Design a protein around this motif. Structure first.
Motif, PDB file in Angstrom:
ATOM      1  N   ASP A 244      25.052   6.843  13.625  1.00 43.97           N
ATOM      2  CA  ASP A 244      24.316   5.511  13.302  1.00 43.97           C
ATOM      3  C   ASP A 244      24.838   4.699  13.554  1.00 43.97           C
ATOM      4  O   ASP A 244      25.973   4.898  13.664  1.00 43.97           O
ATOM      5  CB  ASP A 244      25.166   5.577  11.743  1.00 43.97           C
ATOM      6  CG  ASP A 244      24.655   4.399  10.705  1.00 43.97           C
ATOM      7  OD1 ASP A 244      23.665   3.410  11.795  1.00 43.97           O
ATOM      8  OD2 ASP A 244      24.813   4.503   9.683  1.00 43.97           O
ATOM      9  N   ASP A 269      19.813   2.991  12.835  1.00 43.92           N
ATOM     10  CA  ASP A 269      19.573   2.177  13.007  1.00 43.92           C
ATOM     11  C   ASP A 269      20.336   1.497  14.696  1.00 43.92           C
ATOM     12  O   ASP A 269      21.536   1.069  15.217  1.00 43.92           O
ATOM     13  CB  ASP A 269      21.101   1.032  11.912  1.00 43.92           C
ATOM     14  CG  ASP A 269      20.411   0.455  11.133  1.00 43.92           C
ATOM     15  OD1 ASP A 269      18.909   0.289  10.773  1.00 43.92           O
ATOM     16  OD2 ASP A 269      20.911   0.677   9.911  1.00 43.92           O
ATOM     17  N   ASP A 295      17.644   1.997   7.675  1.00 46.23           N
ATOM     18  CA  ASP A 295      19.043   1.926   6.883  1.00 46.23           C
ATOM     19  C   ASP A 295      19.379  -0.178   7.068  1.00 46.23           C
ATOM     20  O   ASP A 295      18.174  -0.627   5.681  1.00 46.23           O
ATOM     21  CB  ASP A 295      20.003   2.168   7.497  1.00 46.23           C
ATOM     22  CG  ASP A 295      21.622   1.738   6.658  1.00 46.23           C
ATOM     23  OD1 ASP A 295      21.018   1.899   5.257  1.00 46.23           O
ATOM     24  OD2 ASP A 295      22.556   1.647   7.102  1.00 46.23           O
ATOM     25  N   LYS A 371      23.373  12.609   3.440  1.00 45.07           N
ATOM     26  CA  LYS A 371      24.384  11.755   4.086  1.00 45.07           C
ATOM     27  C   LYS A 371      25.687  11.903   3.127  1.00 45.07           C
ATOM     28  O   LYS A 371      25.171  10.424   2.181  1.00 45.07           O
ATOM     29  CB  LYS A 371      24.257  10.739   4.294  1.00 45.07           C
ATOM     30  CG  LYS A 371      25.222   9.742   5.342  1.00 45.07           C
ATOM     31  CD  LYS A 371      24.608   8.869   6.153  1.00 45.07           C
ATOM     32  CE  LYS A 371      25.323   7.883   6.681  1.00 45.07           C
ATOM     33  NZ  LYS A 371      24.798   6.246   7.259  1.00 45.07           N
TER      34      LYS A 371
HETATM   35 ZN   LIG Z   1      24.094   3.316   8.250  1.00 47.61          ZN
END
Ligand SMILES: [Zn+2]
Ligand SMILES: [Zn+2]
Ligand SMILES: [Zn+2]
Ligand SMILES: [Zn+2]
Lengths: 406, 406
Positions: A244, A269, A295, A371
């Protein structure tokens, strides 16, 4: 007689020690309790999380208003209603609120009601929650998710030199959830070893999601460190890496070099939340090797998702239930995305509780991706353990993993 | 027909990512699930925690043997039995094991069965667990505990100069559990502020129990730091301090100076586990100001407790259920200690789960004292939230706190 008897909200604490909303719906089948997670994020496209702003309680973070909305507005509307009618009741609560962002009642008042209804309904039907939600989603095949374990922070999440937010490890070549979870734990424990030896005893204290914040100065110690951890634990070749970038916090070739040199299967992202053109380019560039997860891009927002699909900005949805705030809406967004070729990664928030709803939800969607933390801290391990229980109920022929990564 | 239908054990993960045992007992009232906590400690006087020692699974920490003992030995013995007969069934399991330390079946096989039985029994009687356990203990008055929140580590628990293991804060002048918990959270959050400003962003990563391990070089920054935290949050005068010296890890006047200068109401293991004479001296020296808690001294062991009572070595029992391994035995030790003037502080382990049994247990004992973590990490906050629910069921006249500290 089989209908909703009582609806009651209360403040409880999340895993950071901040208040959130828990809702109990009572029917003749018992008391069904659901709590709402919370991020530090905002979020002009997220459904409204309602906080009190009373500086004398929890420095403005009380949830007494959201709880009052449950107790005095939504609850009274739900008494005597048939809990089996999910869509109808979620739509009811949408219409009670009346605002596009759930700004009146609060998404954190509505969501607890939405979740607890579905649990009361599953009980009324005599099936576990994941089965009931699978019927609601029209999911043809249930499956246990590969868990993507947060292991090294991460940008705004650590005092270290690293620009990107999270490095995750994913036991993608495990053949069962049980196996996946033991592998994840075993690598997490050798990683702790590696970090303790390089950076010392204090370096293995944990972040909000149970992963570590070692003082990495070398912006590429982390990926080699993760490979070392995977080797030492004994699982060479069995793991992938998920990242991420939370790249908004900083605002392509570099992404290609990391994917080519390492088994990175997923990057969330990679660009700024409005850099749709940059998102689209990386989605095309790594198509079939590395999925790109929206996200901050998508924020579980219906119109943001429709945008992303149309512009091919990403090919994976991060699904945060509290960001949209009903179960009917979350499922609809999962179905839509899957229909257009997307994967869905169901997600925790940084502010989690002992609630385990997303465990049943990821199975019920059959997405193969979750996640929900490191294998550390009870608000993460509560999910992972619920997944062990679901797997046990499904038996030895239960499907595991994300087909594309297996 | 009202009896035990199924008993099934499984491995689950604790909040450190290590396997432990969870047991489900199934009756016609539903499925009652209990998980066993675990410490890093051993423990020649503790009941036996059975581990697999298979270096290929969880580096020797598997609980498959304990689980097999549940599934193939204890379970078969419990089917068709009346779950209401707690003493009888715990005694049964003691006799099935046949060893003074539960070394045959494992305390971590027996305890999950003991807890889940009591939950099935409470359901059969139509009362919540805390009520049912209060009947078993003969407790005349229920009460919500002051929570003692682990906040600064601590000896073997941190890389810092500090010799003693834990500094806790206790909202003793709160008038309700709800209030106590908000105060604890509010001070925990200003403490995080203070630590972040002095020692930096990484310094507020958390230990196993949700507290901090700041790099304190000054062996007396911590107590002033805790007073500062209490002031800033707005609760001057409302808090006491609890310490765990875990002094064995290092092996009197100093203790007097800290109690005289600060509001320390409790000191756990001030001396080595066999320094009964030193224990006795400090118990006498601080009698009526600072209670002295036996942990490594007493190890929830029946004969160690009898020793401590006889020699007046301490006046407070740390109660770790997994250290003794039945609920009938734990209750008996609580009753015995209280009869001889002692307090009982019910305790977590460092390896906790989403299980909340000790919340109902501390209420049911009416001890006024619980040590179950910082208001941080879900395996701690799960207890604190269960205490909020119990308080809500009891209503506004429910007793709060430890009379001696109020
Ligand atoms: Zn994220
Ligand atoms: Zn963040
Ligand atoms: Zn220790
Ligand atoms: Zn201790």
């Amino acid at each position: 007689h089989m209908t909703i008897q009582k609806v009651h909200g209360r403040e409880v604490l999340d895993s950071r020690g901040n208040p959130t909303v828990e809702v109990e719906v009572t029917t003749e089948k018992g008391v069904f309790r659901s709590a709402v997670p919370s991020g530090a994020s905002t979020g002009v496209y997220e459904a409204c999380e309602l906080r009190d702003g009373d500086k004398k309680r929890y420095v403005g973070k009380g949830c007494l208003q959201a709880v009052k909305n449950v107790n005095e507005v939504i609850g009274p509307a739900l008494i005597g209603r048939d809990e089996l009618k999910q869509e109808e009741l979620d739509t009811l609560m949408l219409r009670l609120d009346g605002t596009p962002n759930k700004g009146k009642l609060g998404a954190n008042a509505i969501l607890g009601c939405s979740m607890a209804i579905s649990k009361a309904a599953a009980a009324a039907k005599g099936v576990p929650l994941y089965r009931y939600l699978a019927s609601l989603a029209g999911t043809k095949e249930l499956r246990l998710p590969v868990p993507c374990f947060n292991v090294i922070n991460g940008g705004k999440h650590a005092g270290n030199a690293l620009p990107f937010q999270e490095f995750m490890i994913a036991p993608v070549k495990a053949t069962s959830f049980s196996e996946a979870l033991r592998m994840g734990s075993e690598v997490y424990h050798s990683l702790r070893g590696i970090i303790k030896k390089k950076y010392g005893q204090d370096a293995v204290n944990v972040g909000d999601e149970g992963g570590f914040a070692p003082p990495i100065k070398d912006i590429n110690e982390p990926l080699p460190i993760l490979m070392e951890a995977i080797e030492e634990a004994g699982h060479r070749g069995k793991f992938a890496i998920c990242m991420d970038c939370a790249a908004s916090e900083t605002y392509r070739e570099t992404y290609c070099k990391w994917a080519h040199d390492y088994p990175i299967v997923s990057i969330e992202d990679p660009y700024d939340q409005d850099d749709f053109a940059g998102f689209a380019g990386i989605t095309e560039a790594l198509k079939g090797k590395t999925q790109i997860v929206g996200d901050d891009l998508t924020v579980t927002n219906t119109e943001r998702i429709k945008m992303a699909i149309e512009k091919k900005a990403c090919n994976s949805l991060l699904l945060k239930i509290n960001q949209i705030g009903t179960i009917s809406e979350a499922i609809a967004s999962s179905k839509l995305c899957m229909e257009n070729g997307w994967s869905v990664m169901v997600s925790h928030r940084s502010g989690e509780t002992e609630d385990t709803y997303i465990a049943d939800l990821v199975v019920a969607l059959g997405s193969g991706q979750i996640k929900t933390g490191a294998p550390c801290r009870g608000e993460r391990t509560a999910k992972l353990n619920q997944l062990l229980r679901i797997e046990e109920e499904l038996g030895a022929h239960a499907k595991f993993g994300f087909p594309g990564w297996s």
